[PDB]
Amino acid sequence: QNLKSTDRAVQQMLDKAKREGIQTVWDRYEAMKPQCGFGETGLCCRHCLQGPCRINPFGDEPKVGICGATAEVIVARGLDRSIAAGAAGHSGHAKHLAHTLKKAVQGKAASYMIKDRTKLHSIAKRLGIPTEGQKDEDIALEVAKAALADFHEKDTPVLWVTTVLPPSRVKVLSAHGLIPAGIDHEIAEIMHRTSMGCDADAQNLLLGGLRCSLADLAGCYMGTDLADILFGTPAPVVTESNLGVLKADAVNVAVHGHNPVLSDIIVSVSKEMENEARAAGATGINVVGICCTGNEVLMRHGIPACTHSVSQEMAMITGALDAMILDYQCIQPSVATIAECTGTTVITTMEMSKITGATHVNFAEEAAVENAKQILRLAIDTFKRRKGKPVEIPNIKTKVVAGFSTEAIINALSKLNANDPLKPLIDNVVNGNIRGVCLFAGCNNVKVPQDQNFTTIARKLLKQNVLVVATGCGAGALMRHGFMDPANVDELCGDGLKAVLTAIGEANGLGGPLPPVLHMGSCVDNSRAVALVAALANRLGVDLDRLPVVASAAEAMHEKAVAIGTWAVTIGLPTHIGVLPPITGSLPVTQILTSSVKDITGGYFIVELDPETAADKLLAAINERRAGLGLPW
Amino acid sequence: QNLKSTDRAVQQMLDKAKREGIQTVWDRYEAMKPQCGFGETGLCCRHCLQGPCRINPFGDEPKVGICGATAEVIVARGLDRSIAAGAAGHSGHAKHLAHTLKKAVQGKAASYMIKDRTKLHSIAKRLGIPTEGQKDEDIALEVAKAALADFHEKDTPVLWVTTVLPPSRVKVLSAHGLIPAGIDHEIAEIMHRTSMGCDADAQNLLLGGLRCSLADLAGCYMGTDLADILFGTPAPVVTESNLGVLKADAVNVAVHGHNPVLSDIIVSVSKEMENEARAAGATGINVVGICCTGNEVLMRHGIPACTHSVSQEMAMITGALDAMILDYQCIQPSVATIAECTGTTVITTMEMSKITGATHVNFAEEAAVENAKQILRLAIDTFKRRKGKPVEIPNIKTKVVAGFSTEAIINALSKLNANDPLKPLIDNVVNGNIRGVCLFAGCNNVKVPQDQNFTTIARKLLKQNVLVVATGCGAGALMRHGFMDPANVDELCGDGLKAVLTAIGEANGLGGPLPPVLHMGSCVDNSRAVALVAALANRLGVDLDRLPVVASAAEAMHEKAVAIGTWAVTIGLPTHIGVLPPITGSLPVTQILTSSVKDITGGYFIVELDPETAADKLLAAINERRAGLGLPW
Ligand code: SF4
Ligand code: SF4
Ligand code: FES
Ligand code: FES
């Protein structure tokens, strides 16, 4: 089973699924082979009813689409649609939170409130919203209106782009016409320009894609900002991960999806319902996380993470998962069918994300506590039905230190230099103790043995003294393999990095180092890494494309990951992707995305499926940046 | 060549292309055969990097997508994306016109102005915008702001839906949650919900698709409204169509695309440049139309239509097309390559729609006259280079009477009943002289011999006394085969329909009938048919799903046509489509779209590729509606 997942708990559940005849994501992948090479290379178009059009990568006809669309146009249009779809997800998440904040401060949703008043005021100041003499509720109402205004054209550009990057970077992007005019405006313009008989120049198409990726960035940053106002900015926390966090004698409730607007409430209400669970014969309610909603409550409340991404079905296979509470994004719809075999109650909560055969509970912010209790009572009912039945929870878990928001990272650094907190980090970049920074982001993908690229690359970078930060299911992969346990610093980290992690941790009263990898949160919280990198650029007086900072979507799957990778390139980072995106059918598109975009934004994609080779390429990118700053490497 | 096109001028140019070795859309189609059956049936998904996933329609594995997405989810997600892409095009067109009107009334674009002040005031009244005591420029500024506001969420729903359909229809749609909250909001929500791991219930997905189709309707209606304010509401006009409208001794300039914001200016400026053209050895500038921008200037100014849709390359093959001036949508990008052989200067004008190898002229409303003169001077240069060369313009054209805006139709009817203009039409529906109404809409499609479905269906309906109206390239197909020439009324029309067309025409001072088919304009001007049908419903006191009105996208191609067909169903019409949409791989989706949606909106799709059978099915739908109103049939 090691060829499917490198996670030993997942392997154990794959054996259980096999002997019980439960079909998994890996079985469905095997049944798909061999996959279509036209789609894999990007040489397929279905944008009108004259299609499908395909193009043979080499040889004889077909060589061009029916309407005349070339291989490079077809490849660029498909890629742009993926970017727009990703932007639509991250910004739909952000839009929902903006409406939640507006309802809260207008007295329409008493379960929600301004929890981080400091963050509220800093965001207002960053946006140019006056705070002196204003009530918090009025400032927040203005912030929520500004968030909603960024979805459409107005007299200013998207402020969740222009106010979050340094003026020099905004100037570069503006010169190329890349600043978004409105988030949903850009998504719609992509769908228009890529429709039949519209944009048919690969460079023009890809420039539109870069601009739409910045609309995705704006949605990510807005989502983090609003979630922090509503639910609190993360600070360091200690918890656990992997399937062993499930407890046979408790009501096990997974929160799964991305938007934690209800799942933050689930966490608090579940505490109130201890006694009701105890009356049912359970020790209590054990809330666990899956995917990014799990990251959100891990970051803010220390909720343990049960599993992530490709292996999500395995939590159900234990037999102990009483409920899976779903919002949207990255939920395999197979869960609704597997639930018939495993007994789990799968519950959807968002109007636009339902799954046939799953129970739906309308969630409304105005009734959030009431909805939570109804949902948790279904979970309690499910626990009762399995009283007495054996379960198979693998006794496998790791320790996870997390909660490294950018505010938390700055505060940790400020223990070494109170009035200039970024300086200790820059000092160690300059002296070589920190070679550079790598952000791991994105998903697992069934084509890659689960976690193998994240861990193989992370190990090589850590040995070379790279400061590694992680979000999303990249953070999930690293946490499940021990990369967030400070006890593994000695094994994993080069001497210089160990010295820095130890110096920071000792100054924070820990008696021990920071963990080998800093967990910066969910997928939208890739925006936190942007905030840190922008602050470093501002402090050094250089643009982001001069910093020794790279990104790696080492096992990417979702359209959201394509959008993130593209905005990482657009803000100026060398950006690795470890699965093939559908671009290899066009050499001109590949050349733009891996080479000539350097001349536009300073960033570029590094496509590399072999993880040892990818780590070498990422280190070369970091070291090239070091050389450009005159640093040793 | 008759198997490729039923248009004799197109056949002549296909022979010329063949002997000159110029590859056409039909050659590129032949080179694509056999096409992929997974894509044709809808059983392919590329929404994440685990794909492509396909599903065998019958037999053995694969049976389900890798993530667990069923055939019905995959089919519904793909369809929803097509609807959103169509909505993005029609509403991008409308958004551009809203910005043009705003610039005009703020003194920023002197080439544009309020030409239809009556239409402006009626729209303002329909929207609830006060007009008493207000300057026209202020009313128009308010209308343009309202148009822009409908793209995003606000305290009202999309007013270009709720103010254009009768309250009873709005109530039905509201009860099912189908009223759009904002145009670009719905497009983004579709892209979100159809991304991996999000909506996975076919009924829920398709209801979202119906709502997004109404965002498309709003964009169509807004585009017609704003184009009428800026450029004038159409009134009846007489002109010609087909390749014989090109003139060997003139500078022939085609306007091609959809948004006539510059091409209306091209028409006026070309008149000013007669003498400059005459100095070059030409008789003048002969502006001709292709596709919907051609329809726009045909409707408003009588500009002759040269060709449409699938046969657009053939205008270039004549050797006489000096320039092709492009905005966006439905332009085969092959034109940029064919131009090397034919000498035509292909010019793009919109930032988001460029074609490699075509000259780009930045158009800006603020410089519209200056841009037009630069473009027309390139055309004049091109004419000079072909002085002396023979050309092959087929001597084939038809007479076209057009300009039937809904205002024009009401005014024509008012000559029979001044104070109750709809009553003469209803009278003849009730007595059987008019059996019903059919709207022909949409594109040609290379899979169908060009125009064969439109003409075969139209002939059968006209013989059965159906009032036939047409837009877009459906109007193009019918005009090129004589269906807009009143001289063909005797041959084509049943006795009852002939009596009505004759009575209306005689009362309008014509001495002869209205044409066999009423040309209601461009693709966005499908909204004019909605306005007429809604007015009829309001006058009869019934909802639209009780009227004997149907639609036929008989040769559909573009994502825009999928969106139009879907909103035709959503507002309550039986809606034929004559090419296979990618739904046959899912019986449950097909059943929803062809059967159970009747219980939701009262409309339904009729999928039928054989045109004689399609006409029988459309007549059965009309006659079922007649029976429900207690009428003979
Ligand atoms: S848009 Fe062009 S390439 Fe795509 S399916 Fe239609 S004809 Fe084929
Ligand atoms: S979304 Fe599901 S069905 Fe579509 S490509 Fe990804 S795994 Fe396959
Ligand atoms: S031919 Fe397989 S993805 Fe289209
Ligand atoms: S397998 Fe051919 S369209 Fe995807």
Curated annotation (Swiss-Prot), chains A, B:
Keywords: 4Fe-4S, Cell membrane, Cytoplasm, Iron, Iron-sulfur, Membrane, Metal-binding, Nickel, Oxidoreductase
Statement: the UniProt record of this protein carries the keyword Ribosomal protein: no
Cofactor note: Binds 3 [4Fe-4S] clusters per homodimer.
GO cellular component terms attached to this protein's record: cytoplasm; plasma membrane
UniProt GO BP: generation of precursor metabolites and energy; response to hydrogen peroxide
Highest taxon of the lineage: Bacteria
The keyword Amino-acid biosynthesis is annotated on this UniProt entry: no
Pfam families: Prismane
Enzyme nomenclature, EC number: 1.2.7.4
Catalytic activity as recorded in UniProt: CO + 2 oxidized [2Fe-2S]-[ferredoxin] + H2O = 2 reduced [2Fe-2S]-[ferredoxin] + CO2 + 2 H(+)
Subcellular location: Cytoplasm; Cell membrane
Cofactor (UniProt): [4Fe-4S] cluster; [Ni-4Fe-5S] cluster
Binding site for [Ni-4Fe-5S] cluster: H258, C292, C330, C443, C473, C523
Documented activity regulation: Inactivated by O(2).
Family according to the record: Belongs to the Ni-containing carbon monoxide dehydrogenase family.
Subunit structure comment from the entry: Homodimer.
NCBIfam families: CO_DH_cata (TIGR01702)
Entry remark concerning the domains of this protein: Cluster B is an all-cysteinyl-liganded 4Fe-4S cluster; cluster C is a mixed Ni-Fe-S cluster which is the active site of CO oxidation. Cluster D is also an all-cysteinyl-liganded 4Fe-4S cluster that bridges the two subunits of the CODH dimer.
Protein name: Carbon monoxide dehydrogenase 2
Organism: Carboxydothermus hydrogenoformans (strain ATCC BAA-161 / DSM 6008 / Z-2901)
Lineage: Bacteria, Bacillati, Bacillota, Clostridia, Thermoanaerobacterales
